[PDB]
Design a protein around this ligand. Structure first.
Ligand code: NAP
Ligand code: TOL
Length: 317
């Protein structure tokens, strides 16, 4: 199935469902991407910190070599991790991502998190204790380096992730800004419906990409008492009606809000199921019901970074 597009401010077309790759093992992610491309996926969400981009790259190159897909029809997103915000490190980190992915360009390159981390060998540099150690460079510094990539044709568009509206304002207000973000990739699902942030982003011509749309049940820190979207009986009730799965309803929820969504799986049958979401529709009542489930609950609150200056989640939205 071909996912529907969401038009970006650049007029590029971003497929509304993509494949997530956080936690996808080296040993499984290459097959996951191959299965996804065969099943009609064109958008793949990647990151340097996921430490699996080289296997994603192998999958894409092989599919292009087998004439299963053309590069112009793929939509590949990656992200700049916050230990690489210093000018020279932006370029080096990008170059490693691009080399690993075996691509000539990225469709979108995101600021992964706004709050900067100390540069050095460690991906997760620690206080003592282990709250995050902050960095010298800020996301505004990083953005300027990222703009170079767009000028040089290495990236078609920039975006942000885990930004509050205040942080988007800071960016949009930056003197000498060359490129505006095309998306804000944030956690979004029926327990964190992001009404105000989505309103704000859309009002600025910025799309929203919903991460952890199934509640990230495989996040390492899940506790059995934590909210569970996939086992929510009211979600299951609405799925059963449609003869669909819970997952499919959780994905379709975003589509109907014109929000891009990136469910992760390495299980072939689930990869295929998760893009089977364009032949049913949730009713207005069903959408209103699911919207009403908001709990302000984050699977990814990253509280160890909450003392850093640009920690995003102290703002209302
Ligand atoms: N920008 C950011 O800061 C950030 C943060 C978090 C996530 N993300 C992105 O968003 C993607 C999605 O979020 P996520 O990985 O946190 O979690 P998710 O997509 O909400 O949930 C993934 C989990 O759901 C399972 N699953 C997938 N399809 C299913 C189905 N149809 N039925 C039952 N279980 C199913 C997967 O199992 P199997 O894989 O075993 O099948 C995996 O355990 C990430 O992979 C990443 O690309 C970005
Ligand atoms: C900005 O801080 C982050 C950001 C991401 C993480 C992750 C990752 S890689 N994810 C939540 C996935 C992602 O950011 O895409 C895992 C553990 C701690 C993190 C932390 C932190 F260590 F603080 F808790």
């Amino acid at each position: 199935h071909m996912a529907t597009f969401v038009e970006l401010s650049t007029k590029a077309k971003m497929p509304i469902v993509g494949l997530g790759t956080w936690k996808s093992p080296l040993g499984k992610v290459k097959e996951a991407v191959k299965v996804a491309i065969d099943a009609g996926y064109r958008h793949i969400d990647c990151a340097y910190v996921y430490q699996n981009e080289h296997e994603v790259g192998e999958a894409i190159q092989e599919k292009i070599q087998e004439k299963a897909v053309k590069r112009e029809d793929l939509f590949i997103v990656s992200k700049l991790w916050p230990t690489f915000f210093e000018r020279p490190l932006v370029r080096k980190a990008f170059e490693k991502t691009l080399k690993d992915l075996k691509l000539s360009y990225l469709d979108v390159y995101l600021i992964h998190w706004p709050q900067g981390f100390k540069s050095g060998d460690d991906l997760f540099p620690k206080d003592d204790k282990g709250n995050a150690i902050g960095g010298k460079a800020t996301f505004l510094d990083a953005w300027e380096a990222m703009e170079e990539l767009v000028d040089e044709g290495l990236v078609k568009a920039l975006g942000v992730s885990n930004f509050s509206h205040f942080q988007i304002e800071k960016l949009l207000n930056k003197p000498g800004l060359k490129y505006k973000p095309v998306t804000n990739q944030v956690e979004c699902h029926p327990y964190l419906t992001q009404e105000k942030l989505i309103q704000y982003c859309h009002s600025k011509g910025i799309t929203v990409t919903a991460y952890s749309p199934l509640g990230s049940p495989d996040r390492p820190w899940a506790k059995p008492e934590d909210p569970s979207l996939l086992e929510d009986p009211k979600i299951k009730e609405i799925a059963a009606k449609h003869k669909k799965t819970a997952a499919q309803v959780l994905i379709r929820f975003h589509i109907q809000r014109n929000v891009i969504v990136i469910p992760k799986s390495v299980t072939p049958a689930r990869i295929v199921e998760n893009i089977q979401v364009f032949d049913f529709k949730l009713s207005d009542e069903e959408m209103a019901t699911i919207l009403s489930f908001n709990r302000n609950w984050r699977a990814c609150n990253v509280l160890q970074s909450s003392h850093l200056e640009d920690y995003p989640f102290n703002a209302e939205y």
